[PDB]
């Protein structure tokens with residue numbers, strides 16, 4: 001059976017059955033992550049996806065400078081982060097919490113108030129069972145912190161667990177705790193029915209809020225920085241009115257956030273789900289940032305749930321995660337979340353400035369022009385000279401870039 | 410001048426400045442994607458992230474069987490997809506559309522009605538110029554299909570463009586078209602002001618709806634399949650009541666969807682943004698699937714916006730994307746979206762069945778027992794033999810798995 005075959009046997013079988021070509025088999029064999037690691041981490045393993053990784057520059061958070069590992073396939077994301085970080089100069093923490101959530105959900109509950117009374121008088125025993133079900137997190141100074149109770153639909157009761165999982169994302173800790181407590185619940189309440197017991201990825205107790213305050217002159221190379229700031233404010237407010245913009249606005253933010261999450265070995269689906277769900281405010285999907293003009297400064301703020309990890313999951317077992325974490329110089333998960341939120345705000349700034357100025361299309365083209373200048377051998381003032389001239393005609397390629405460079409030499 | 414340096418020079422500089430260790434530099438150098446490709450795709454390039462890729466099994470969509478490339482770092486995702494697909498047996502398309510969206514947004518509009526009237530009488534010219542701004546897509550049978558107009562509070566007007574981008578995701582086509590039309594708008598309306606012109610990732614005209622119908626006996630190896638089906642229906646209903654569950658429910662779906670999107674070289678942020686926004690219904694974030702009982706069958710349905718690509722972006726320039734596409738063997742992007750939506754529904758089925766039965770933790774450990782057996786060298790009948798013995802006691806690691814394997818071989 002395929003599940004029980006070695007990776008080599010799996011690839012040989014796919015080729016034999018005509019499901020992949022010999023060239024595809026050879027490419028699937030071209031890997032850099034150890035086969036033993038890859039085949040351990042997932043099931044039915046055959047190969048890997050390689051996502052380019054680069055370095056985001058100029059980010060400063062609470063007066064500490066960072067070099068940001070960013071894994072993405074999308075052109076201009078990393079250059080845009082670097083551009084936004086450089087404009088903003090620095091980011092400051094406004095607020096931060098870090099707890100992870102789980103739930104045990106009962107169903108067919110005749111009297112939710114009565115069930116809640118029986119749970120609430122037993123909270124000390126629940127906390128003791130939570131520790132017994134995962135003792136190591138308590139030893140390390142974390143563990144269950146709070147129990148909350150919600151009733152739904154005259155049938156359901158959610159017992160909400162708020163847990164300090166220290167530097168892990170917390171799925172294994174929380175799920176082990178919940179399974180152990182659910183076993184005790186089944187002993188105590190043999191006639192109540194538990195539907196499921198599972199983590200929640202909606203990590204509303206891991207929200208971090210970061211801000212920046214930018215002199216408006218930094219928003220343009222000319223004298224119209226205030227008029228750019230006013231337009232950034234309008235574009236950000238427009239995301240609160242039109243979900244077709246809000247989705248794209250937040251997608252841009254996530255181009256930066258997801259790139260760091262992926263590079264550091266964190267779970268990209270969990271961050272995406274928590275951030276996009278948090279975008280729903282007052283019943284409408286809206287932007288995750290706010291931009292306002294205060295005096296002669298453009299003020300930006302982001303607020304996102306970032307239950308990120310510096311240990312566990314794929315943060316250590318994948319060697320590239322460890323390499324990215326060395327570059328980023330962060331071992332504390334609270335700090336990781338502050339940095340990642342700042343990346344999202346810097347990314348959004350670069351996007352909004354471009355959108356309301358030359359446009360993102362022209363912004364991409366300017367990056368392409370500079371790349372072409374560098375590829376054909378321009379150095380120093382030559383790079384900006386070739387790139388600026390490339391921008392004056394619509395067709396750009398290496399032949400034209402070299403002709404410009406050689407004409408200038 | 411980090412953007413000008415070569416990748417090797419970048420890594421040497423980071424080492425020289427004490428920002429990375431020698432061991433980190435060596436690991437960053439351990440790469441399988443061509444440096445020339447990686448350095449041209451992104452900026453400030455130094456290395457790559459490697460995401461394990463496996464094969465999701467048993468998926469059938471509209472009576473065609475598939476083998477699904479899935480790139481993920483999370484244990485159990487691929488085996489869970491395979492389990493859900495096997496239980497479901499097959500998926501059927503309910504409906505599908507495929508158009509991409511962009512917008513030109515005007516601001517400080519004194520009279521939105523008058524502006525819309527002036528644009529609407531000029532649609533032929535808008536259609537003529539959208540072609541001129543990207544003629545290849547029209548030559549290929551695509552292009553602009555519809556213009557819509559929305560006015561807002563605070564003096565904004567959005568001109569909405571609905572575009573057939575054929576097998577591309579469409580960012581380059583749509584953004585080029587919008588830029589060219591915006592130039593024409595500026596010539597026409599000197600007193601109006603355009604705030605921006607950009608695609609929308611909220612691809613509500615690329616929604617696909619897929620369904621499955623499952624005899625309830627298939628939900629348990631015992632005689633209680635109907636009772637499992639009832640609990641799946643209630644767990645799915647609960648996601649309509651509690652956003653704390655809905656987010657996790659949809660995250661599970663996206664473990665499967667994102668794995669295929671990533672493996673095929675598609676943009677994972679775009680799919681995540683469109684799918685999670687689409688989860689908002691009647692002002693509340695809810696599940697992307699529905700499960701009901703009808704005719705002693707468990708009936709599941711998913712509906713997601715999937716503006717996916719089989720050309721462009723990273724679908725061809727990354728060799729692993731082409732390898733994944735060979736394995737998957739879809740004919741066009743519409744078919745890719747149908748398969749990916751079916752993956753999401755199969756994933757959700759496997760998750761809900763486990764949640765209401767033995768629990769996800771027990772399901773993870775059963776898979777870990779087999780994985781440990783294979784990691785230490787078990788083959789054939791040894792895989793299940795080692796795994797079954799591992800589950801009889803508490804310690805789940807490689808040392809114990811190897812001790813069992815060597816003992817069984819004595």
Ligand SMILES: CCCCc1ccc(NS(=O)(=O)c2ccc(O)c(C(=O)O)c2)cc1
Nearest residue numbers: 076080083249252255350351354360363364
């Ligand atoms: C210094 C470069 C200037 C131009 C530029 C700016 C940003 C990006 N990347 S982005 O922020 O990820 C991004 C991409 C596409 C988008 O549509 C959006 C959005 O609409 O908000 C955001 C790319 C180019």
Ligand SMILES: CCCCc1ccc(NS(=O)(=O)c2ccc(O)c(C(=O)O)c2)cc1
Nearest residue numbers: 485486489492657658661664759760763772
């Ligand atoms: C045959 C395996 C049986 C057990 C099992 C089933 C599914 C998965 N993966 S999953 O669907 O991606 C997923 C993971 C974690 C989750 O909390 C959820 C959710 O809550 O919906 C979903 C893993 C294990």
Ligand SMILES: [Ca+2]
Nearest residue numbers: 499500621622
């Ligand atoms: Ca079916």
